[PDB]
């Protein structure tokens, strides 16, 4: 039984991780359309959170041949949860009808703050797609239980060693 | 009989705790949305208020192989506490009806303050994700009625000791 | 008999249970349709709440290989609780006649409210389709015991062990 | 004979309760509709007032093994005495005849204020399915006695124990 | 017996699948009309939702020289997931008659909203024309149980290895 | 003696089946003609009645070789019980006579509806005929005694084993 | 001698009951049909008033394997209750002759209304083929006596054992 | 005995099929004429729903050199059943006499409506006649046993193999 | 036996091809008319979509002296793709009638976007004509199972040499 | 097997690559049009997005006579990565209609800023166009293994060198 030792452990054992090429091109060929649309920005989130999840667990345990990436960051963690913010706040507002109603931007939001959280989104993928373009976070699985500490249990020693 | 001892006790023994990983993930993957909407801001609450309740009280106990989170807390409560109250003061007013009453940012609220009170959601969820993300509250069980006091009665000695 | 221990027990007990693969695939070819329509949001309701009923009870108890989902929870509850509540508000005015009243959205109703209470159905189905497309809420049985904490009482230990 | 104390008793004997399962239940698979029709709304109220009666009074008890939910209630009483208001005042007016008045939000009523008391039902259920789902006010029977103080008489020790 | 696991594996062994080529050119294919009608858009969903079913299950298995798509997906998900809703919700109002209601976009509707929901057809049909067009999701069956992690049960070693 | 178990029985054991290829091509080749006319849509209804009855009621069992379909359903239920519905609203207004009364849709019935309630049947046909179309409700007979829970009576070991 | 306790009692021992079966079948091939016509809504009331009467009463008892139905209910009564009165409000008017008065939607009734009435019967049949498709208010006997309270008399112990 | 398998069968193995180069010229060749009159939408249906009957069933098989279509298809089957909808909804008013009645599109129906549902034949029939134009669900019966998986039984080996 | 290797293959094997010289012509002899017209633009596609098919598969191959075009590519991909879009969302709207409804351009659509949309029909033409009149994706097939990786099965070496 | 190392090599095997010759000339007749059109800027990507993805990973490996282009480039990557961004944020904005709303840059965004980012795609394409025009991140395959250091495995040394 892979264990979560003390409390230091019940962190990084669940959704400190997933996969690795996911996002990866997932930031490249995420760039394949626009960020402003409440396509791009918005739906993003997914394609990314459907990539950190309870994997290597207590009753479990981290890959053999399978190295991956992580979440709980110095690098990561406050660029990862930094992206998702700015991919969702460039309104709500299309005072539209049979005649748009023009007072958008002529009294009304900060409309040019629009055309600055538009970006946020281009934006926060190659800090990532950098920190992450050098082996951050990252390993096999012998660095897992590692860079955590919590010690694995189960004598598997006969056909399976430890 | 687990106890509650004296004018101290009959605070952390109550909805002072709950759970572990709920929140934890139910941190980053409730960021798999937007904060704005009457949906995602709104709704959070009771996805972690369904998740600090009446357990380990005094006719009963606090878990063997249980550890859990804290509430009540000089790191965590003052966040905790806190996050709730900025993801749900975003207006009510949608001056719309067959064409949208233009006047929301024309003449009346103070419009930018939602872009302001937008974000506190997004916010106070890495704080937390952070402060929690090294083992804080958190505790087995024998550190429960310790870091409380809270003195357990019952000589189960004999097949279930103490 | 599987037991309802004291005031905590007489909730998860009761239809906070019932399927699986139900309403998950009856989430997807559920939008294999529209959710304007009287049909589509409507009828929806009972496809899922034809989902939900007293298994697993007092004088009764919960599977052996007959693991399942649940409704009262802290990821769930508030989005299954959530989605019921917006595809059932999008009116019932339909001024027509020979010729249909064309007042509907001419001086009446808030109409594009309609259009916003649209998309609500399509909506909560993914937070959802996700949040339950990683293994939440779910279990075997004995884990119902378990994270519920009601206790099954009558010793079929020779021929049904316990 | 089960007793009924002084100016304190007169209440919480009465109906300040009857079941438990009923409404809890009758709270999800009542969503299973719409709450605007005078179906919906209007129609619950019985489902929920035919489960609050004069149960456990003076000339009798409250149950052995017949715990049971409560009323007059600091957590329930304001939601329970809360939801049936709102369920109830969504107009009478459908000015129709051969070809429907049209002037229904034309120049008449506050009509959206419909679409506001639309809700009001969706809503309620889950506050008090909620604060019901963590077991408040309800109780076995030596807890009502005792909550309220009502004093039991008749020494039925020889036979049926007090 | 190939099997189901635990709290993981109750999705990605249901209708997270079914096809390849279909939906691939039924992407090229299906423009060759238009969305706009209540026939391109619409009728859409089932051309695809009759591609997507319990297909290697747990009483059965996952296909030899049988390679396929996926639905739950980080890449296709969020894109598979979102165009169904947006080729569907062009309205329901042709106020016409034997003199069209004139009144269609001179006081009603938001008419050009239609103009902006005409297209998220035409769409999200090349995001995963593309994102699919590089092999994701897709698997023989050998990464079936590998990506999902479900053993399958068994020894068909002497004439079905296993 | 199959049996009818408690409270949960007395439902599914009574017309929630019948049949099978019934209704399938009877919901195809019942197409071969138009619903609106008295004849179509009316007519309908028990070329499919003819199809839901006690069978495999308690004094009896349910079919080896004889799978067969499911009414109150999850899926089914509310779209069987949909359909019914909608081919039955569609006028009995036909003010005719030597000369036909012209006023049908010049001062009286809202004329158009029957237009709208022409097609509800032409529809939940493939709602049905898909839902359908993919293995639901339907089972051989281990599955209803199993999906239903009721336990059939009756030693038959010898020559016809149980 | 079954009895009739005190002020609780003199009602469900009275047509609170009489059968099963009945009006579950006779809710959906009572569909078989159409509401409307004098025959359809008019004549269901006793096809179900001829099944809710005078059985076990003081002077008998409740069912040995003859468990039932009940009305008076607070899931079931509103809605038993409820339908009967959308069934028989739809008009008396048929302004016929050697030609038909013309004038029924051209000066006279609320005509449409009748189109709202028209389908209320179609309706309260599923809300109880639900309710009711689920054990509600039913019970073998030995739950009558029980969920009422009413006490039986007469020790037939010898041969009949009480 | 060709087989029916499981929950997946009993659909594709009757009426999904019949013939091949049918409908295909009846498709081109029914366009001989026109749509509008109840000669052309209307009786067209059969010519067709005389082409997807109870062919290949369980006792008896499918085709040698018997190659042929598909009716339930996710490239067809959503055009199949789609188009046998809009060729009979054009009317049944012709408010003729002696002196027609001039009101048909003077005051009553939607007249145009008509205009809209005329081509709704000439139509469907290209987009199946295209789909169909590339060989789309047609096959042998090797890849009908396969494309379904339902299993034929009896070992003809000697004289006619398998 | 040509093949279909991995994750990278199930592509371009399958409808990324057809033609050559078609659609050439097809686009210069194709502006011999008039894109606005629901002639011009709508029918388009197919004469296009009638060159893009399941040609060179794995059970068969691809072309010896027969060389061709190709769909998906960075160059051709998206304008092909493109194109398609923009010849079909001109309007539906010619409110006409005895007199025309006169208000199409004096309060309704955005009339001036037809003006918009009538020209990228014209467009997309040259744009694809250019890149493709240097040939782009274009190859004999030696370059096709190379360009993809695609190896090819079945030592043809006596009499048809691989 | 050619291989993937540690936490360096998990980034340069997987999409920092793919072509040479497409992008190339693809930024010279590319400029072929115009930028600003929703064409132009945006349609762009994939024409390029289209070139770079999962080639030389680590079950196969990179090109013999198969040299080709790279993005994470500390010459090229701030420059590839740069673009992409500057060609997609020049509005949604055509307050336009049946008179455009003439309030573009009368009253709302900060219109010349279009005019800024019109250009950023014409611009980033010869930076690139340049840095690119003398063989940067480039190389034949013998250099891929070596300037990101990953091992290949497996003797194929008779008949196949290593």
Sequence with gaps: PYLN??????????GTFAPYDVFLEILVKSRSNSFQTQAGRDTLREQLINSLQIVANLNTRYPLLGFYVWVRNPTLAPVFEALL???????????VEEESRPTTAETLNATQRVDDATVAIHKEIDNILLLLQGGTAVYDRTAFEVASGLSWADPTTTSTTT
């Design 85 to 95: 913010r700015a991919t969702d706040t460039k309104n709500r507002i299309i005072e």
């Design 5 to 14: 030792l003390t409390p230091l452990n019940l962190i990084y054992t669940s």
